């Protein structure tokens, strides 16, 4: 019996009153539009935006901590080299804005050097992410922004085949170019590759030796959240799968890194975390389409002037529910992303990694996406600040959260009545 039930639960009586009143239903649908704009249309004030920015930054910061310590080398097939030095620019190396892959003889592989094949995948993803972060990530709803990315690497040493026409795609090793396209995010991304040889004895050449320089210019690279998350996934998965050998220089006093020496997939807790953050951010961004698909701005009411009937006139409700649920799911995942990395709830060696390295910057803060000779061994990806802004944004989403829940409950009531 229902009277006896609405005794025990006063709020359900109120919920039923609201559900049969178009003025209240329409008010809930307005709220849903406003909270959607908050989530997918804002940046600073959106928990969703902050949780995405945070996942991306954790991946980037992971490599700014460990890149410099990581071995790489060999030749183009992933095989050992006799005498190859391949230097990637705008990478966070020991006291340097480049990372040098010059480990010979050892077979590239697990607990070995990272292959140049893997380092190129890693590097491309990193250059794209640092360029996007530097420009600013758009709001989640903006899926057609692009960005332009440029990066260089050099090859030297006898037998080094990492910059040769065969690998590079270029016809002429000295002054040749190649344009190739590729279809990512349903979007055409143009790449321009150009090669150039500087001789051992040639005007302004510090490195006493002969080398080849490769330039990659990428236009039309999608900067949407889904796309940039796919880039961070490639970064952290390339590292985890290649699982190369690293060894570190711990500074005097500072913070202490454990272990010194080892392999990169050995940071299991940290990698799992970053992967989970990315996975939750991708799911969270996925809710954008559900929201878009179920717009809530058509006002609702009875048929033919006669009063609203919650049992027959409520076919909008499935869409209202789906929307409200999607919004709620964005908020919870956003929260979940933050709790995965927030050091308040971390323990042991994993907490020490986050508070002493990941959430740290050694740069003389400098803007996002900036690599300096002091970037190594520090995240330089605004991790403390992003955790803080996520929390701030959630705290300023108090009202909206309650409105989403109320909208979810109204719709749910109506879906029920309509069976």
């Amino acid at each position, epitope marked *: 019996n229902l009277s006896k039930l609405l005794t025990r639960y006063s709020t359900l009586n109120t*919920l039923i009153k609201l559900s049969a009143d178009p003025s209240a239903i329409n008010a809930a649908r307005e709220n849903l539009g406003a909270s959607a704009k908050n989530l997918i249309g804002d940046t600073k004030n959106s928990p969703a935006y902050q949780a995405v920015l945070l996942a991306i930054n954790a991946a980037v910061g992971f490599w700014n901590v460990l890149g410099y310590a990581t071995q790489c080398g060999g030749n183009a097939n992933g095989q050992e080299s006799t005498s190859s030095t391949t230097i990637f620019n705008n990478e966070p190396g020991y006291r340097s804005t480049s990372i040098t892959c010059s480990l010979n003889r050892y077979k590239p592989g697990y607990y070995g050097p990272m292959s140049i094949e893997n380092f190129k995948k890693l590097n491309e993803a990193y250059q794209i992410l640092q360029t996007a972060l530097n420009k600013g990530l758009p709001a989640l709803k903006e899926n057609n922004g692009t960005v332009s990315v440029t990066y260089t690497y050099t090859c030297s040493g006898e037998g080094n085949d990492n910059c040769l026409p065969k690998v590079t795609g270029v016809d002429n090793q000295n002054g040749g170019t190649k344009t190739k396209t590729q279809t990512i995010d349903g979007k055409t991304v143009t790449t321009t590759i150009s090669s150039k040889v500087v001789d051992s004895q040639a005007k302004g050449n510090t490195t006493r030796v002969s080398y080849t320089e490769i330039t990659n210019k990428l236009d039309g690279v999608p900067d949407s959240a889904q796309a940039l998350l796919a880039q961070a996934s490639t970064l952290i998965n390339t590292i985890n799968t290649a699982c190369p050998y690293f060894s570190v220089t711990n500074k005097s006093g500072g913070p202490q890194m454990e272990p010194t020496r080892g392999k990169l997939c050995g940071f299991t807790e940290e990698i799992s975390a970053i992967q989970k953050m990315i996975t939750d951010a991708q799911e969270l961004v996925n809710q954008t389409s559900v929201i878009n698909e179920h717009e809530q701005s058509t006002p609702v009411g009875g048929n033919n002037g006669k009063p609203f009937n919650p049992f027959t006139d409520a076919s909008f409700a499935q869409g209202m529910l789906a929307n409200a649920s999607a919004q709620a799911k964005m908020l919870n995942l956003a929260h979940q992303v933050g709790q995965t990395i927030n050091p*308040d709830n971390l323990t042991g060696t994993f907490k020490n990694f986050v508070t002493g390295f990941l959430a740290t910057c050694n740069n003389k803060g400098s803007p996002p996406g900036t690599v300096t000779t002091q970037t190594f061994a520090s995240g330089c990806a605004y991790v403390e600040q992003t955790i*803080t802004n996520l*929390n701030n944004s959630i705290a300023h989403f*108090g009202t909206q*959260e309650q409105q989403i*829940q109320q909208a979810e409950n109204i719709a749910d009531t109506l879906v029920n009545f309509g069976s």
Partner: nanobody, 113 residues
Framework: VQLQESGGGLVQPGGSLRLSCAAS????????MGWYRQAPGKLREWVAA???????NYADSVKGRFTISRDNAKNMLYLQMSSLKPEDTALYYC????????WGQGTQVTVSS
């Protein structure tokens, strides 16, 4: 996974009350926490929030009159209410933000006469 509010009562308009909330660590630690209230004939309304680092924010209905605070050593949340009006009459609840799906019993505040 525990929320236990206390401190409420019947008071005069003009009055003041201090509400307390014992939260478990699982809920409380590293989390934005807040106060809610559910008045007669209405659904639950958000009132105030506070980040782990201590930054508070308030609903327009209570800004200027209520202070929310947190004690991170003992997972306690507090709401100091001042200049109470009859309109503040409700059941008050703490939760984290975004909300844990099980609410505590709340504590009744009645402002009257």
């Amino acid at each position: 996974v525990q929320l236990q509010e206390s401190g409420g009562g019947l008071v005069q308009p003009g009055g003041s009350l201090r509400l307390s909330c014992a939260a478990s660590g699982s809920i409380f630690s590293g989390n934005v926490m807040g106060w809610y209230r559910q008045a007669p004939g209405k659904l639950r309304e958000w009132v105030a929030a506070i980040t782990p680092q201590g930054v508070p924010n308030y609903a327009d209905s209570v800004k200027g009159r209520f202070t929310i605070s947190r004690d991170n050593a003992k997972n306690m949340l507090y709401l100091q209410m001042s200049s109470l009006k009859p309109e503040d009459t409700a059941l008050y609840y703490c939760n984290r933000l975004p909300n844990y799906r099980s609410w505590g019993q709340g504590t009744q505040v009645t402002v009257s006469s």
